[PDB]
């Protein structure tokens, strides 16, 4: 209702910020290609501009990473999915980092270097959620986190129900359907504003999603190449697994040597730009885009992969097609150039997300999946040139559907979900290939689940962040006896005047255990300290409402750590007062469960 | 994995049963229309066959409702959403009722009377889930219920992600994402088999969903009729609310009078068939389908409503169109016939779901929504005959999109969800109108949420079933003091030989509280009775492993009933041992919370 009105201002602001950032990104990008073309074709000088614009934007982005942001480097979803699991970092929710991130992420987005988008966008979306929650409802924690995640991804791509599925499907154990309704209304209004604002200020005609991919939708697949879809499940998951593995292969290489550690403490600025430099050394179009089509910034690149005609048959013609004219070298077969494009983007993207940058883990993987898909689609077009017959209509296959289903499959495989297929068909604009892409997505997901861990789980493992995982293993003897803390603070109601002044002057924490007597030791309830301070001081001044809430839990003192973890998971709660016979004996905290489950 | 293999046999069987039932339904239906046409046009005799086939099939269905099924009359989802909230009815999960229902539901489906499909299909899906869970994993309760719900609706309509959203979005408070993954894999394989089996035995070409609705997808909406979409939100929700209200207006009329109660105990068979009779009295095409198009069985009827051309402009021509030729009376404007169709199906469908029949609450409502949508689409086509201009292309509007978005909207409004829009676009086959249908669905949902209760909540209210609801009301003084049961059974470990033989001969229940001493009164844990029986008897025979699990909960004796309800909700648990100082004092059961929250 009126919390819906809170949500509708949230989505309005979030869509204004997203349109702003990709608008300025696209304008900087067209200015880049524009001046690059229009100065002169000078093979020293076009090389000079091809180097000197992307490295200076990435240096600018990394400067904003360094100076203003003390902790927001490498931002994304896994730290906040650890936050909603409990490990709170309020200083990491600073508004000041917010503006410090986003424009650098615009510099990240405006670069021709492959970056993701969604991750730090989800982070700033949860930032705006928390700040507006501070600003409204004065004029529930993981609820605002969850809704911020939903609004962030649905405001990236205009994909509401993919937004809410990408919000639920990993970042929880249980989930309240209230927040489902909240985030679904939020995500649909954020998606709605993002597209109509386009048709307002700029040209957009009507409301296409982003990428109208005009397929024939008349005898689409058929069911003869369908086991080929089986291959594009399993193989993608295979290679996708390797991707995550190789990311660990460089993150350990990030922090294995004292030599580069010493030189990075010596000079932090040196590391990103230079390898940006060297991948630009393989990107320059009359250098290597003769074999790479290096004049493909990724958005229009993947729009060119969704071309609804066979490029091998159009390798037979010299026709000026659309942007797919970049996909012709006049001597080299185009399967080779697609293969080289795929493998070279593949090893560049891990290096791209390696550097100390706010990096989303979705977009270049999505590009790689589209690459592999149109690869196998074009070779199946070469494999069956004949097509089939139908009533006065010869129907040959077309590789655009293969491209979009593989671009679902492989990033779903890396990301360990199925909600990626949802935003995949929602950005493709037609839902012909819906059940085969769901099949292939789940095939790749179970292969990936079998082989290698998640992307973000490997990220928090390597970054060594406090987080409770589990792998369904309850062995013989795990008991909470080396763990509980026997330091107990205590308040009684039958404590009088001097004792209560002493409690003011000796204690500091936010809420306090109330018992009957310290000799009885039995925990009874809990009272906020500051309300007691209020009652004492605002009775002291006029000189010259006591409600008792109950402790919802109690820990039987031989509980196995799996079941203890399960208890805090299903309660969604932090701490444990460990008693026998009510008499308080120990205290178990969250970080000690992590230190326990180290083994 | 191999529980996935459990799931894949489940979905294979479920899709075989669904294809079987609608195959036989369609064959009986085409035989009905076939013999009806081909005997002769005799206005007494065609009236005779028009009566005598539907009432005899409905009598047959009601006979199967009566004799074999003792409790499965009026089956659907709200009893099982009460079961997964706790109120178990194992006798209502009888396999014998299963075959006793489905063929009568086939008789329900094969009738020309408007029935739903999904509800009892969900019920038999959860039946097959439970039975296969008994059969596999010898060769977790609400998990199998939830997955059965998902498989049931996704096996109805071939709509997997709509299946899992319709499984979650009402039938829970919290939800495990494990079951999300389970049911998503299950739902996609059930949807997958349903369509490929079509292309195997019968003709199907390739894999369309059901209803390819060929729209132009080129300048689709535009954003000038978009506030008209606002109307088709709110108005539908308005009228949809009235629908649920009028259902109560007849269900009380079901059980208000002792006269019809006496005559129904006198003769139960009389009630359904005769009103079937009288709505057939308004269905006969040269009687009233001259103004109704009564020769429209509902599936091809709604396919005819998704006609991508303006029937008012084709009221200008005498052209033999497709089945839409039934939409012409040569003297009466077709807006009038659509209006009369809508209002007459509207008051017939509540009477149709009234009778003691397994009735789904989705399909005729979906028909009514499509009716209202094409109504307003045709009058907007009459309102703007000109259309707009674009580059050498004059584009006029078309009412098929209005029909499909209203057919989302109104049944989403009745059903109190948003997942209905998902299965709506997934059966339409194109996703042009995706964000406006989401907007209109949520508009109608908040109007319906504002005005009138849910369909199924009104159903369980009137049928007076034990179920804990809540309406966010925690007043001044609600306390658990008139409620707890002070009858306590007790077991000690230091009880010896004669006492343990006495415990065998005096007690009966499945698991038992273990304490230290009955004088101490403190609850310590719980042990299964039958394992103790096993240890005693299978030690007694060789004459001539004692594990202690802990009680996870304890009730502070002044807990408010809202927070008690909240405790059992978030635990998902049944009972409460109510102690002070560990010493057991009372027992609180589930039905007493319902008897409490009566006020």
Quick recap:
Chains A, B: The record marks 118 as: Protopore gate. The structure is a homodimer of 599-residue chains. By secondary structure, the first copy, chain A, is mainly α.
Structure commentary:
- Two copies of one chain form a homodimer.
- Chain A is mostly helical and 599 residues long.
- Chain A has helices at residues 3-38, 45-66, 77-84, 95-110, 118-135, 141-157, 160-168, 177-196, 198-201, 226-254, 258-266, 270-280, 285-289, 298-305, 334-354, 363-383, 400-415, 419-428, 434-451, 455-463, 497-506, 529-540, 561-571, 590-597; strands at residues 388-390, 393-395, 491-492, 511-515, 523-528, 549-550, 576-580, 583-588.
- In chain A, β3, α21 (497-506) and β4 (511-515) form a beta-alpha-beta unit.
- In chain A, α1 packs across α8, α4 packs antiparallel against α5 and α6 (141-157) packs across α7 (160-168).
- At the A-B interface, α7, α8, α18, α19 and α23 of A face α7, α8, α18, α19 and α23 of B.
- Chains A, B: The record marks 118 as: Protopore gate.
- Chains A, B: Residues 37-44, 200-225, 287-292, 305-335, 377-399, 433-435 are extracellular.
């Amino acid at each position: 209702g009126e919390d819906g009105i809170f949500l509708v201002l949230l989505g309005l602001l979030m869509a204004l910020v997203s349109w702003s950032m990709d608008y300025v990104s696209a304008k900087s990008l067209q200015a880049y290609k524009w001046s690059y073309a229009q100065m002169q074709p000078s093979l020293p000088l076009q090389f000079l501009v091809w180097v000197t614009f992307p490295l200076v934007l990435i240096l600018f982005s990394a400067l904003f990473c360094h100076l203003i942001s003390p902790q927001a480097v490498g931002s994304g979803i896994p730290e906040m999915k650890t936050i909603l699991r409990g490990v709170v970092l309020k200083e990491y929710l600073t508004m000041k980092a917010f503006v410090a991130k986003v424009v650098a992420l615009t510099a990240g987005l405006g670069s021709g270097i492959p970056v993701g988008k969604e991750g730090p966008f989800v982070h700033i979306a949860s930032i705006c959620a928390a700040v507006l929650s501070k600003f409204m409802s004065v004029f529930y924690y993981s609820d605002i986190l969850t809704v911020g995640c939903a609004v962030g991804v649905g405001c990236c791509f205009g994909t509401p129900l993919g937004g809410v599925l990408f919000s639920i499907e990993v970042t929880s154990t249980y989930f309240a359907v209230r927040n489902y309704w909240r985030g679904f209304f939020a995500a649909t209004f954020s998606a709605f504003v993002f597209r109509v604002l386009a048709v307002w200020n700029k040209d957009a005609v009507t409301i296409t999603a982003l990428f109208r991919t005009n397929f024939r939708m008349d005898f689409p697949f058929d069911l003869k190449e369908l086991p080929a879809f089986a291959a594009i499940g399993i193989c993608c998951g295979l290679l996708g697994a390797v991707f995550v593995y190789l990311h660990r292969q460089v993150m350990l290489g990030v922090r294995k040597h004292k030599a580069l550690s010493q030189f990075l403490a010596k000079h932090r600025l040196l590391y990103p730009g230079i390898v940006t430099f060297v991948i630009a050394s393989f990107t320059f179009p009359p250098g290597m885009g003769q074999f790479m089509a290096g004049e493909l910034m990724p958005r229009e690149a993947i729009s060119t992969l969704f071309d609804n005609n066979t490029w091998v048959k159009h390798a037979g013609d010299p026709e000026s097609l659309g942007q797919s004219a970049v996909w012709i070298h006049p001597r080299v077969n185009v399967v080779i150039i697609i293969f080289l494009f795929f493998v070279m983007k593949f090893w560049m993207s891990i290096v791209a997300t390696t550097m100390p940058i706010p990096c989303g883990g979705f977009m270049p993987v999505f590009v790689l999946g589209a690459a592999f898909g149109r690869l196998v689609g074009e070779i199946m077009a070469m494999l069956f040139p004949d097509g089939i017959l139908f009533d006065d209509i010869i129907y040959k296959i077309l590789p655009g559907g293969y491209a979009v289903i593989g671009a679902a499959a492989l990033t779903g495989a890396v990301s360990h979900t199925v909600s990626t297929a949802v935003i995949c068909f929602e950005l493709t604009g037609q839902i012909a290939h819906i059940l085969p892409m769901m099949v292939a997505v789940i095939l790749a997901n179970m292969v990936a689940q079998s082989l290698q861990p998640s992307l973000y789980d490997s990220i928090i493992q390597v970054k060594k962040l406090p987080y409770l995982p589990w792998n369904q293993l309850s062995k013989y003897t795990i008991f909470v006896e080396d763990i509980m803390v026997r330091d107990v603070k205590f308040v009684s109601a039958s404590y009088t005047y001097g004792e209560l002044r002493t409690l003011l002057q000796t204690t500091t924490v936010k809420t306090l255990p109330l018992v009957d007597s310290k000799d009885s030791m039995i925990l009874l309830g809990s009272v906020e300290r500051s309300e007691l301070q209020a009652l004492l001081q605002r009775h002291l001044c006029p000189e010259r409402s006591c409600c008792i809430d109950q402790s919802p839990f109690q820990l039987v003192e031989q509980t196995t750590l799996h079941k203890t973890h399960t208890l805090f998971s299903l309660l969604g709660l932090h701490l444990a007062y460990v008693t026998s016979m009510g008499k308080l004996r120990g205290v178990l905290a969250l970080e000690e469960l992590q230190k326990a489950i180290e083994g």
